[PDB]
Each structure stands twice: as structure tokens, then as C-alpha cells.
UniProtKB/Swiss-Prot annotation, chain A:
Subunit structure as annotated in this protein's UniProt entry: Component of the NuA4 histone acetyltransferase complex which contains the catalytic subunit KAT5/TIP60 and the subunits EP400, TRRAP/PAF400, BRD8/SMAP, EPC1, DMAP1/DNMAP1, RUVBL1/TIP49, RUVBL2, ING3, actin, ACTL6A/BAF53A, MORF4L1/MRG15, MORF4L2/MRGX, MRGBP, YEATS4/GAS41 and VPS72/YL1. Component of a NuA4-related complex which contains EP400, TRRAP/PAF400, SRCAP, BRD8/SMAP, EPC1, DMAP1/DNMAP1, RUVBL1/TIP49, RUVBL2, actin, ACTL6A/BAF53A, VPS72 and YEATS4/GAS41. Also part of a multiprotein complex which contains SRCAP and which binds to H2AZ1/H2AZ.
Subcellular location: Nucleus
The protein's name: Vacuolar protein sorting-associated protein 72 homolog
Function comment: Deposition-and-exchange histone chaperone specific for H2AZ1, specifically chaperones H2AZ1 and deposits it into nucleosomes. As component of the SRCAP complex, mediates the ATP-dependent exchange of histone H2AZ1/H2B dimers for nucleosomal H2A/H2B, leading to transcriptional regulation of selected genes by chromatin remodeling.
Post-translational events: Phosphorylation is enhanced by ZNHIT1 and promotes the interaction of VPS72 with histone H2AZ1.
Superkingdom of origin organism: Eukaryota
Native source organism of the sequence: Homo sapiens
Family listed: Belongs to the VPS72/YL1 family.
UniProtKB/Swiss-Prot annotation, chain B:
Lineage: Eukaryota, Metazoa, Chordata, Craniata, Vertebrata
Protein family: Belongs to the RuvB family.
Name by which UniProt lists this protein: RuvB-like 2
Keyword terms of this UniProt record: Acetylation, Activator, ATP-binding, Chromatin regulator, Cytoplasm, DNA damage, DNA recombination, DNA repair, Growth regulation, Helicase, Hydrolase, Isopeptide bond, Membrane, Nucleotide-binding, Nucleus, Phosphoprotein, Transcription, Transcription regulation, Ubl conjugation
EC nos: 3.6.4.12
Binding site for ATP: G63, Q64, P65, G66, T67, G68, K69, T70
Length: 58, 435
């Protein structure tokens, strides 16, 4: 019944998973990424950049 | 210490009018000495300016040369502050090859009227904690901002992604995003870039983390003069003419359109009029056409308070053969109030010399003060003022600490005033040209 009821009440999980997808359309993509990372020998932090390529050809 | 653009000028000691709450001038306050009646009148005129309810009030400061007319004008300017516009021109500045005298007087009047615009803006302000941009080789992206109070993850549109890429936004940047137009401004960094990156040779100070909500409704105040509005609206590339001064005679229809929309902006809540002061020093250089324009120009509701100065007595009006008081026609003199300045006494001259020595940082003995006061009374106040500097230099040359009488006598003998130079010119008149 909960699964049946979720046909009406599953407003949250399904919408969140459909909207906040972690992937995009096919093809070559170049991802610029920059995150805070903690410094090593609020806390001491520094900024670091990663560049990610979808395929070896690009 | 360091030599700034602004140095010690002829009125650097003037800080204001030196008045109390009742506009009763002090003997020596804010760099002003004497001129009690003239300074009280200047205070009343300054109150009239600050009230802003009356348009086109003209005041003429008339007095003998060196009696403090420009000093009083500069005191009014200092006590007015930067909020209220105060345009000071020489009367000879209106004679232009780029525009007519009447156009120049209009631009001078319209420069002395501020328009204080207000607008509300949506501003995002926070620390970039993560930024991801993915592009083919449309662009997609995700940006997270923090502000101590909250941390929100944003899904970025293409235009915002383009702006962020152009600004080169990186994690650890304290940025500001104007939601109205997408303009991105960086306030500063919050912590260093990775030490492992070569080059990047900087250790700039890190601004403190923003606080409160990420998005705030911020009210911003922008002030422009009527002349800036006119020049901007005069042509497609008008804004460039605000700096180069290549402004031809702006069409009167554009000025009427601006006056009307400014009136609407002040009937609405969009803008507030800040009427200021136009100071025409040495107004006797204006010709009859300029005075005749000033007559009608002061009758406009957008006219500022016009302050004028001249030392001419009953003299010939330029461009005519008629003589009138102050070199101004009686028709304009009727439209103005005259404030008269009186010659100084020994005490006032000594106090002025003391203030000038203090501003020039010259230590000088009391006997030197007495001899310099006698010289200033005999010759002129400005001559004694310039002897202050010359005697300081002569004293420092001899490795002295306090300017004594010997230095004043030395510089008096070195540098002549108008009278002794004139006597020597007459003694050698045959050597000079055309007798
Ligand atoms: N009441 C005063 N207080 C302080 N300084 C004054 C006063 N009157 C004149 N001075 C100074 O003496 C000089 C006189 O020049 P100025 O004031 O331009 O006279 P004017 O404009 O009447 O020719 C200036 O350096 C001025 O700053
Ligand atoms: Mg003067």
C-alpha cells in the first residue's frame, strides 16, 4: 500500500533524483573544477583546481 | 610625509567659515581670521544653500584686493562638504572656441546641480567554496557559496557560466553577483591558492568571510549632475565628451526633456535634487552678453546659488563703453546681494601670518612675527605670506631652526614687492620698452 500510496505521495524522492542528476548528455566534455581543500604540513584551507577530460581522444 | 598631488596652496589653511551654531563668527576658527560681517553673511548664504528651497539666489563678494573674497568662497566650499556640488570657475573660462558663452554658462549652471539617483539591487555576496564548469569540445555548471550563516548550491545558466568564466572565478574568492544584470565583481580572496602551483607569486591579504544571508536587497546611491545627463543624452557617444569636453551646443530640446524627466523622478521616488553652488570668481571678465544671460538664467527653477567675486570699483563693462559698479550691469546688480569685505588690522594680519606659518610648518620668532606684520601692513598680505616661505628656506639653508629677523630682512632684500619694483623700474625707465 505504501508503494501504491507513493504513486501520490512520492513527490520528494523521485523529483529530487530526476532534477539533481549527476550526469549530462553524451559526448566530449571538459570539466573545470575548483574546491576548497584543507592545508597540510575555520581551519587553514587552500584552493585547488582539477581539470577532467571525458575521453582520451580529447 | 609623502608628496601628494595636493600641496600647500594659497588657501590650504582654510577649513571652513569658523562659525558657531548661531552663525556668529569666531575671531580665529577653521583657519578664518577677522571678516566677521562677511563670514556671518557667508554663513547665512550657506544655510540658504543647504535648505535648497530657493533657486537662483545670487551673492556678490565685493571688496578690496587681498581682503579674503576667495578665502571666504573656499571656506564656504569646505563647510559645504563633497555631497553638495560646488563648481568654481574663473570668469575667463567661459570664453571658448568649442561653444558659445551662453552654452558655457549653461553647462556651468547645470554642473552645479546634482541629481541623487537611488535604485534597489539584488546582490549575492559569499565565499566560493566550489565551482564546477563542464563544456563540450552548451555549458553546464554548479556553484556553491558560503556566508557563515548558510551554504547554498546553485545551478548555473549559460550566461552566468560565461560571466563566471570571464571573471575567472575560483574557489576561495569572495565575490558579488548583481542578479539584475549578472555583473560579477570580486571583493577579494579568503585564503591562498594551492602552494603547489608555481608562479602565482602573491600573498595578498585575505578579506573576512561575509555574514548574514547570501542574497540581500541593497539600496545604492548614485549622484550625477545635470550636465552629465545632458552630455550622455546629447549623442550616442556622449559619455566620452564628459572627459574630453568636446561638447557642442547641446540642443535645448534635450535639456527640456531632461528637466521634465528629472521633475518626474522627483515627483516619483527615483531621484532627489541636490542644488549646489556656482562660484564665478573675477566675474568682471564676463561681458554684457554673459551678464544678460545670467539675468534670465537665475530665474530658472533649476538654477543653483551663484556666488561672485570682483575687486573692480566703478569700471567699464567688458564689450561696452558704460561704467557700472563692480563691472556688473545694474540689471544684474539688482538681482544680487552684495557682501563687502573690510581691510584687516595688525592683529588680524598677525593671526593670518601665524596660521600660514603653521600650515607651512615654519617656526618663527615673535620679533620676526612683528617685523613681518609691519611688512605685510606696509606692502601686502600676500607678499608677507610669500616671505614666510622664502625666509623658511633661507633659515634652513643656514641650518637654523627658527626664522629670525635676519632671514626676513634677507628675503625682503632678495624679493621685491610691486612698489619697490615699480620705483626701480621708474629709476631705469629708459631701459624698459616703450617707456
Ligand atoms: N580671513 C582670512 N583668514 C585666513 N586667511 C585669509 C583671510 N583673508 C585672506 N586670507 C589669505 O590671504 C590671501 C589673500 O588672497 P584672497 O583671499 O584670494 O584675497 P582676494 O580674493 O580678496 O583677492 C590668501 O592666501 C587667503 O587665503
Ligand atoms: Mg581672490
Amino acid at each position: 500500500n505504501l508503494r501504491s500510496l507513493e504513486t501520490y505521495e512520492r513527490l520528494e524522492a523521485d523529483k529530487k533524483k530526476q532534477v539533481h542528476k549527476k550526469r549530462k548528455c553524451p559526448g566530449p566534455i571538459i570539466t573545470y573544477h575548483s574546491v576548497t581543500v584543507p592545508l597540510v604540513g575555520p581551519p587553514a584551507r587552500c584552493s585547488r583546481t582539477f581539470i577532467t577530460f571525458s575521453d582520451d581522444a580529447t | 610625509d609623502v608628496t601628494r598631488i595636493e600641496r600647500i596652496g594659497a588657501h590650504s589653511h582654510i577649513r571652513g567659515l569658523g562659525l558657531d551654531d548661531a552663525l556668529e563668527p569666531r575671531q580665529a576658527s577653521q583657519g578664518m581670521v577677522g571678516q566677521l560681517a562677511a563670514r556671518r553673511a557667508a554663513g547665512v548664504v550657506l544655510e540658504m544653500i543647504r535648505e535648497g528651497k530657493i533657486a537662483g539666489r545670487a551673492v556678490l563678494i565685493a571688496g578690496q584686493p587681498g581682503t579674503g573674497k576667495t578665502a571666504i568662497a573656499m571656506g564656504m566650499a569646505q563647510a559645504l562638504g563633497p555631497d553638495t556640488p560646488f563648481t568654481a570657475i574663473a570668469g575667463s573660462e567661459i570664453f571658448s572656441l568649442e561653444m558659445s558663452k551662453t552654452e558655457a554658462l549653461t553647462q556651468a549652471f547645470r554642473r552645479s546641480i546634482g541629481v541623487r539617483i537611488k535604485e534597489e539591487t539584488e546582490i549575492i555576496e559569499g565565499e566560493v567554496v566550489e565551482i564546477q564548469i563542464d563544456r563540450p569540445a552548451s555549458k553546464v555548471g554548479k556553484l556553491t557559496l558560503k556566508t557563515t550563516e548558510m551554504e547554498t548550491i546553485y545551478d548555473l545558466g549559460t550566461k552566468m557560466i560565461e560571466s563566471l568564466t570571464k571573471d575567472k572565478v575560483q574557489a576561495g574568492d569572495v565575490i558579488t553577483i548583481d542578479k539584475a544584470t549578472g555583473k560579477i565583481s570580486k571583493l577579494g580572496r579568503s585564503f591562498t591558492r594551492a602552494r603547489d602551483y608555481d608562479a602565482m607569486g602573491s600573498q595578498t591579504k585575505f578579506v573576512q568571510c561575509p555574514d548574514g544571508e547570501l542574497q540581500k536587497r541593497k539600496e545604492v546611491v548614485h549622484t550625477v549632475s545635470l550636465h552629465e545627463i545632458d552630455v550622455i543624452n546629447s549623442r550616442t557617444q556622449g559619455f566620452l565628451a564628459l572627459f574630453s569636453g568636446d561638447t557642442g551646443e547641446i540642443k535645448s530640446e534635450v535639456r527640456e526633456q531632461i528637466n521634465a524627466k528629472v521633475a518626474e523622478w522627483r515627483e516619483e521616488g527615483k531621484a532627489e535634487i541636490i542644488p549646489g553652488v556656482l562660484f564665478i570668481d573675477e566675474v568682471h571678465m564676463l561681458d554684457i552678453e554673459s551678464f544678460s544671460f545670467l539675468n534670465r538664467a537665475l530665474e530658472s527653477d533649476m538654477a543653483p546659488v551663484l556666488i561672485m567675486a570682483t575687486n573692480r570699483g566703478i569700471t567699464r563693462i567688458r564689450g561696452t563703453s558704460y561704467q557700472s559698479p563692480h563691472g556688473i550691469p545694474i540689471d544684474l546688480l539688482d538681482r544680487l546681494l552684495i557682501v563687502s569685505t573690510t581691510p584687516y588690522s595688525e592683529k588680524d594680519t598677525k593671526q593670518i601670518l601665524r596660521i600660514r606659518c603653521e600650515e607651512e610648518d615654519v617656526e618663527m620668532s615673535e620679533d620676526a612675527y612683528t617685523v613681518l606684520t609691519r611688512i605685510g601692513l606696509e606692502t601686502s598680505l600676500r607678499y608677507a605670506i610669500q616671505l614666510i616661505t622664502a625666509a623658511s628656506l633661507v633659515c634652513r639653508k643656514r641650518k637654523g631652526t627658527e626664522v629670525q629677523v635676519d632671514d626676513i630682512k634677507r628675503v625682503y632684500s632678495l624679493f621685491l614687492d610691486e612698489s619697490r619694483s615699480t620705483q626701480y623700474m621708474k629709476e631705469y625707465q629708459d631701459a624698459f620698452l616703450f617707456n
